[PDB]
Ligand binder design. Structure first.
Ligand SMILES: *SCCCCCCCCCCC(=O)O
Ligand SMILES: *SCCCCCCCCCCC(=O)O
Ligand SMILES: CCCCCCCCCCOC(=O)S
Ligand SMILES: CCCCCCCCCCOC(=O)S
Lengths: 334, 332
């Protein structure tokens, strides 16, 4: 009797730019050997990390996202008024509400634009990019920001000899809009809810809030279990992502896995059967693991250093918390 | 150089089914006092009773229950679903996310998913994101579930809001339909009013100073009333417009169940048919935030007021100052 209208947008969409923010404070391996019993040698060998970035007390996941978003637009040659919507992916927004997106949009002077927060561990970016590209193609928006942002510092147990030296702070943003040629492939994603406990906050905020003066929550990590899972399962994931995009492994110029751990990633590369000269992102060396923020920060570093060029066929695999993953083939931004 | 494939899913996508979960325990107006009354609370809010989830229940647990039912009503098993989006404001864990757990609990542990946070516009956005993913080729059928557990967030001395919030979850199955079943998403926000609805103290600042006060949900009634009542009429007009439907065509208005008086003014402004049906689940459900709309859809469908395939305007509004709207067809 009646018909609901249907819309459509751009066919091809891509990473118009990347913009990275990294906090002033550089915390060395040595400067954590205080509260733990190990060396710089030890930490570096098992993780790949040399130094990491720590945000200041007044800095936040939303402030850092804003400064990243600000830089992204500059690199894309656009102002806030060109943006139709922003998606924030984070694990360290410390308010159940309000969301971060609207605050960010307002900070940048695009106060009324659409936006939500996407939470999916370190698969957030892959999912957010997916949703963005999907929204623009459907005609929901034309140009979008997607920003991985993280203030992990406050959640570290400085005595937790298993993960204290892994997490760090930062934010990086990309611009997604119409492009001459297809620049973002299909999103390949999934989960493993059974191993949800592998990466977690040990105490929920409500339990804690009812008994405040007792032990406070921290980020907890079952290393071995997350290693085995990432290293033995993401190899296939990436192949599903290349297969979807219709690309051979030997065509990937740039590998940007989530910066969880250097050993893991090394193993992922060998598995994926890439070219001997594919550029594998290793930002983790001086950035540390920045969760949902890692992939875009990885991209930015590879471009800043000139090891990757704009237009390079890249493969992104995000993996981590909740045991979730998201992957896709893209063209390098900027 | 080298091509990247351009894929495409099914063009037309709708709501196959709705499924609701509401906790056992009924908390009556009387069972909460501040300095108020049954006739006081019903006048400003439209609430009579609300439901509270038990101490062993969660956002995630209710979501699963809701999904499981949505799945039953769809005539589908968890193996038919390609992904789940959980929209919530009360999953009290920074990580891991709720979606894979719900996925695990449903018995489809492998499927994709995430948590989408956008105040009470969460559902509008999550529905949008779903249809978009299905139309794009990344999923054939999906669950969108709104879940909420606001009981522990409420401050019993807050004469402004303590009687407003409740617990509950409701999910929908989205998938290929003979005709277009989800209108174009119409959304936006007002960042400059982020504090209108907020958690007064962040979790870390609280954790670093536990001898101070604990966080609670704080609300600026007046500012939230002005905004919602006098802006969301336009949003409704923009959503009906995108859907290529006239106001006088709408069978069912389902605004977010924030406040009956807000929603009362909205209906007048929207200039719908005298016989348009208005979501009032709030009377006995209360404000369940990101879950209100699907709950209201299920309540209307259970009640007979809304039939399957009715034309329904959805308008989600709330925290962050975020809004999301669409014209959908009624499921089941
Ligand atoms: S993919 C990496 C996810 C782990 C970081 C998530 C944020 C910290 C976890 C919460 C810790 C806390 O604040 O208690
Ligand atoms: S759109 C509804 C806005 C209020 C619901 C958001 C969750 C409650 C805020 C958190 C309060 C707390 O810290 O417990
Ligand atoms: C002593 C070995 C070092 C631990 C290796 C496990 C690394 C997994 C960290 C992944 O966390 C995420 O952010 S995901
Ligand atoms: C000026 C009269 C005040 C009435 C109280 C307003 C209630 C606002 C409820 C907030 O809705 C949300 O879900 S947030």
């Amino acid at each position: 009797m009646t018909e609901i209208a249907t819309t459509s947008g751009a066919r091809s969409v891509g990473l118009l730019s990347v913009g990275a923010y990294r906090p002033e404070r550089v915390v060395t391996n040595d400067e954590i050997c205080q509260h733990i019993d190990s060396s710089d040698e030890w930490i570096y060998t098992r993780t790949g990390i040399k130094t990491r970035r720590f945000a200041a007390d007044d800095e936040s996941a939303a402030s850092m996202a804003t400064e990243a978003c600000r830089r992204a637009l500059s690199n894309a040659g656009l102002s806030a008024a060109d943006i139709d919507g922003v998606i924030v992916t984070t694990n360290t927004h410390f308010l159940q509400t309000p969301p971060a997106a609207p605050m960010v949009a307002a900070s940048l002077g695009a106060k009324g634009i659409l936006g939500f927060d996407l939470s999916a561990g370190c698969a957030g970016f892959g999912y957010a990019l997916g949703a963005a590209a999907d929204m623009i193609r459907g005609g929901g928006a034309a140009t979008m920001l997607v920003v991985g942002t993280e203030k992990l510092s406050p959640t570290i147990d400085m005595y937790d000899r298993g993960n204290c030296f892994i997490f760090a702070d930062g934010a990086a943003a990309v611009v997604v809009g119409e492009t001459p040629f297809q620049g973002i492939g299909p999103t390949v994603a999934g989960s493993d809810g059974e191993q949800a406990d592998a990466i977690r906050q040990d105490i929920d905020w409500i339990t804690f809030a009812q008994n405040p003066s007792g032990p406070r929550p921290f980020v907890r990590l079952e290393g071995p279990a997350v290693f085995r899972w990432a290293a033995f399962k993401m190899g296939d994931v990436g192949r599903r992502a290349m297969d979807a995009a219709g690309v051979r492994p030997d065509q990937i110029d740039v590998f940007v896995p989530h910066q969880a751990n250097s050993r893991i990633n090394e193993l992922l590369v060998k598995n994926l059967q890439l070219r001997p000269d594919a550029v594998v992102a290793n930002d983790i060396e001086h950035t540390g693991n920045t969760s949902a923020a890692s992939i875009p920060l990885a991209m930015a570093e590879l471009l800043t250093t000139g090891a990757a060029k704009p237009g390079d066929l890249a493969l992104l695999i995000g993996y981590g918390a909740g045991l979730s993953y998201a992957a896709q083939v893209v063209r390098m931004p900027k």
